């Protein structure tokens, strides 16, 4: 629509961190992440750092954490909403068993094709079913076709932030009981801690209010148990109770 530009350069928050020490974040990456990062994940991350929407790339220390959660809960079938160049997708495919299956949804296939060569070299492309679409229609169609035996073990939500609450209503019905839903960026550069935050691009302000709404909603939702973790840009782990 007509109006102002919504490029990455038009944002204000991209360089802000939720950790107060830039030396600490680099320590975590250099000490505990990069030595454990897959060769193809390193290649995908380095090309993505050059991309015009590099700020959306999931943090590498969060990637190792998502892989740990997948292995500890022995997830076999997952769904990812918001693929971009596919770092968390490749992280998920490497963590799942050899017969693991992933449904990856993103409106932009061109982003996915940048990281697909690294996904192929890692030899886990067969686990991924990419759907070039808006997520909400795909989710709604799934609820009409999904049976209880094929419910997802794990869901990673990382697409358009203001739509998280809408995705939530479908995903607690598409994720198995005891499964996990992980919402990315639920701390939104730390701006969620304030009733008002000046200097924001209108889209960043929308997610500040939408995440402040979502965090209250998730803390009051009886269908799930939650855990908000201050890793990366913040994330909220949801475990379905019924």
Please pick, from the candidates 37, 80, 106, 158, the single residue that binds Mg ion as defined by CB under 5 A. 158
Query: What are the backbone dihedrals phi and psi of residue 44, each rounded to the nearest 5 degrees, phi first?
Result: -65, -40
CB of 140 to a second copy, least distance (A): 27
Residues that constitute the known binding site: 58, 84, 88, 106, 134-135, 158, 160, 184-185
Q: Is 83 in the site for ligand SAH (CB under 6 A)?
A: yes
Pair 61, 33: CB distance under 8 Å: yes
Span from 7-15, 56-64, 169-177, 230-238 in contact with ligand SAH (CB under 6 A): 56-64
Dmax (CA) for the chain in angstroms is: 49
Shortest Cβ 94–ligand SAH spacing (Å): 13
Least distance (Å) between residue 129 CB and a second copy = 24
58 binds ligand SAH (CB under 6 A): yes
The least distance separating ligand SAH from the CB of residue 57, rounded to whole angstroms, comes to 4
Q: Is 153 in the site for ligand SAH (CB under 6 A)?
A: no
Q: 149, 123 in Cβ contact below 8 A?
A: no
Tokens of 56: 């959306």
Tokens of 162: 């203001």
- Please give the radius of gyration of the chain, using alpha carbons only, rounded to the nearest integer: 17
158, 163, 165, 169 alpha-carbon torsion, rounded to 10°? -90
Give me the residues paired with residue 100 across strands: none
> Does 106 interact with Mg ion (rule: CB under 5 A)?
no
Contact between 232 and ligand SAH by CB under 6 A: the answer reads no
The answer to whether 233 touches 185, Cβ cutoff 8 Å, is: yes
Shortest Cβ 110–Mg ion spacing (Å) = 19
CB 135 within 8 A of CB 81: yes
For residues 118 and 196, which CB has a smaller minimum distance to ligand SAH in the complex?
118
Helix (H, G, I), strand (E, B) or coil at 91: helix
Q: Specify the length of the chain in residues.
A: 242
The pattern of x and - marking residues 62 through 91 that bind a second copy according to CB under 8 A reads --xx-xxx-xxxx-----------------
The residues of the shown chain that bind ligand SAH, judged by CB under 6 A, are 56-58, 81-84, 87-88, 105-108, 111, 134-135, 158-160, 163
């Amino acid at each position: 629509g007509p109006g102002m530009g919504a490029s990455q350069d038009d944002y204000a928050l991209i360089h802000k961190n939720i950790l107060h020490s830039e030396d600490l974040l680099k320590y975590i990456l250099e000490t505990s992440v990069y030595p454990r990062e897959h060769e193809q994940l390193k290649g995908l991350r380095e090309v993505t750092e050059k991309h015009e929407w590099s700020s959306a790339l999931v943090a590498a220390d969060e990637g190792l954490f998502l892989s740990m959660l997948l292995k500890l809960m022995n997830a076999k079938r997952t769904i990812e909403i918001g693929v971009y160049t596919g770092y968390s997708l490749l992280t998920t495919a490497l963590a799942l068993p050899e017969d693991g299956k992933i449904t990856a949804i993103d409106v932009n296939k061109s982003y996915f094709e940048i990281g697909l060569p690294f996904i192929q070299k890692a030899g886990v492309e067969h686990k991924i079913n990419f759907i070039e679409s808006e997520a909400l229609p795909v989710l709604d169609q799934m609820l009409q076709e999904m049976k209880e035996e094929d419910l997802y073990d794990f869901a990673f939500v990382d697409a358009d932030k203001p739509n998280y609450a809408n995705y939530h209503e479908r995903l607690v019905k598409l994720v198995r009981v005891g499964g996990a839903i992980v919402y990315d960026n639920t701390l939104w550069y730390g701006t969620v801690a304030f009733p008002e935050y000046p200097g924001l691009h209108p889209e960043e302000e929308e997610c500040r209010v939408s995440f402040r709404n979502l965090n209250k909603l998730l803390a009051a939702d009886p269908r799930v148990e939650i855990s908000q973790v201050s890793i990366g840009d913040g994330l909220t782990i949801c475990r379905r109770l019924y």
